[PDB]
Amino acid sequence: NFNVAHGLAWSYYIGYLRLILPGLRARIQAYNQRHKNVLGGIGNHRLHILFPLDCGVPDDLSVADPNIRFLHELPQQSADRAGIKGRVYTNSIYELLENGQPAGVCVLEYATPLQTLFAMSQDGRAGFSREDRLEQAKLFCRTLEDILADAPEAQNNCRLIVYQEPTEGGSFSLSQEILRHLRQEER
Amino acid sequence: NFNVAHGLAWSYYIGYLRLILPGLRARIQAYNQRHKNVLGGIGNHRLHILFPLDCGVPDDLSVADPNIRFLHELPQGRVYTNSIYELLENGQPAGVCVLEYATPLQTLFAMSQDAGFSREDRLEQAKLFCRTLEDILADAPEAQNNCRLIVYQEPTGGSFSLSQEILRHLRQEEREV
Ligand SMILES: Nc1nc2c(ncn2[C@@H]2O[C@H]3COP(=O)(O)O[C@@H]4[C@@H](O)[C@H](n5cnc6c(N)ncnc65)O[C@H]4COP(=O)(O)O[C@@H]3[C@H]2O)c(=O)[nH]1
């Protein structure tokens, strides 16, 4: 039984989003304070989560797209978690380039449960192919969104950036996709 | 839909157990080399995962039992650290091991506190989570030999001694070595 998406959504919400999002805005503030009249401030205070519905996450997106560039990590959030003293949650600020110059800066990351789905389709078991990985990833996204619609505070502290990928041409820039979202929160 | 246990089991094995267990021996013996002549070695090389079925998972193990005292961190993108604890019995140290809870049970717990999820629903997801993960471990001798579930049903305050439950499993593991 590989019907796993509902689990992934509730696990992501309770085990990460609802634990890390109430502290995010203060760790962005803290970082702005440490480098205020040097680095320049992060204005957008929401966590940007990439959701590639093919479940293709690279281990270093900075080296993936040359228009996405690691800036700094936020101040760490260390916490005792279920017997693990000092479990560490870290988050990263990235810069986005457009047509040469910089154009965006935000706290950004991939939705980690999509890696789970990815490993599941590669593990050699019988009834879980990319087809199923695809429908699981969309059910995951759907359920997580349903969950956030009933959590206004968490919904106001992050932004979900969902996209498929054309596996052919330059039909898609991920920086372009992120920049459009940042210019929608514009509003 | 609250059939969550299946996603919890696959999540916990694929995104954690599968990724930390292979290099657990090496972190232990690096610790043993660092701390041999002073703090002392860690004999038992396996991760011990507490699995309370009532989903009572405090973040500090000493709060669940004063006889479980933190000894030292097991050190070492995304970072994975663990905690070595020592078990007191009759006021004296009786066992040492890398020990932690199965964090996803906290997901089950918070779901019951809400929506559409009751305490019995929770207990049955906890039991389904347990069976599926144990099904997965039986299929992965690699991972199966380097961890141990410690499954129990008491609210971890009482005349139930969680430290005794752990010391029991620790001795049984020494027996089949
Ligand atoms: N980006 C990011 N995501 C995280 C982090 N911690 C958790 N998550 C996400 O939320 C997890 C569910 O939280 P939980 O701690 O209850 O999970 C359980 C947790 O008990 C265990 N685990 C994973 N990493 C660690 C860890 N570093 N330390 C201790 N336990 C860990 O295995 C986790 C499932 O891993 P996963 O597939 O990455 O699952 C999502 C994972 O997508 C994190 O630090 N960074």
Curated annotation (Swiss-Prot), chain B:
Residues 1-177 are cytoplasmic. In absence of cGAMP, the transmembrane and cytoplasmic regions interact to form an integrated, domain-swapped dimeric assembly. In absence of cyclic nucleotide (c-di-GMP or cGAMP), the protein is autoinhibited by an intramolecular interaction between the cyclic dinucleotide-binding domain (CBD) and the C-terminal tail (CTT). Following cGAMP-binding, the cyclic dinucleotide-binding domain (CBD) is closed, leading to a 180 degrees rotation of the CBD domain relative to the transmembrane domain. The pLxIS motif constitutes an IRF3-binding motif: following phosphorylation by TBK1, the phosphorylated pLxIS motif of STING1 recruits IRF3. IRF3 is then phosphorylated and activated by TBK1 to induce type-I interferons and other cytokines. Belongs to the STING family. 2',3'-cUAMP binds at Y16, R78, T103. Homotetramer; in presence of cyclic nucleotide (c-di-GMP or cGAMP), forms tetramers and higher-order oligomers through side-by-side packing. Interacts (when phosphorylated) with IRF3; following activation and phosphorylation on the pLxIS motif by TBK1, recruits IRF3. Interacts with DDX58/RIG-I, MAVS and SSR2. Interacts with RNF5 and TRIM56. Interacts with TBK1; when homodimer, leading to subsequent production of IFN-beta. Expressed at higher level in the spleen, lymph node, lung and bone marrow, followed by the small intestine, heart, liver and brain, and to a lesser extent in the stomach and kidney. It is found in: Endoplasmic reticulum membrane; Cytoplasm, Perinuclear region; Endoplasmic reticulum-Golgi intermediate compartment membrane; Golgi apparatus membrane. The gene is STING1. Residues 2-176 are annotated as: Cyclic dinucleotide-binding domain (CBD). Phosphorylation by TBK1 leads to activation and production of IFN-beta. The phosphorylated pLxIS motif constitutes an IRF3-binding motif, leading to recruitment of the transcription factor IRF3 to induce type-I interferons and other cytokines. Phosphorylated on tyrosine residues upon MHC-II aggregation. Dephosphorylation by PPP6C leads to inactivation and decreased production of IFN-beta. This is Stimulator of interferon genes protein. 3',3'-c-di-GMP binds at S11, Y16, R78, V79, Y80, T81, T103. 2',3'-cGAMP binds at S11, Y16, R78, T103. Facilitator of innate immune signaling that acts as a sensor of cytosolic DNA from bacteria and viruses and promotes the production of type I interferon (IFN-alpha and IFN-beta). Innate immune response is triggered in response to non-CpG double-stranded DNA from viruses and bacteria delivered to the cytoplasm. Acts by binding cyclic dinucleotides: recognizes and binds cyclic di-GMP (c-di-GMP), a second messenger produced by bacteria, cyclic UMP-AMP (2',3'-cUAMP), and cyclic GMP-AMP (cGAMP), a messenger produced by CGAS in response to DNA virus in the cytosol. It comes from the Eukaryota.
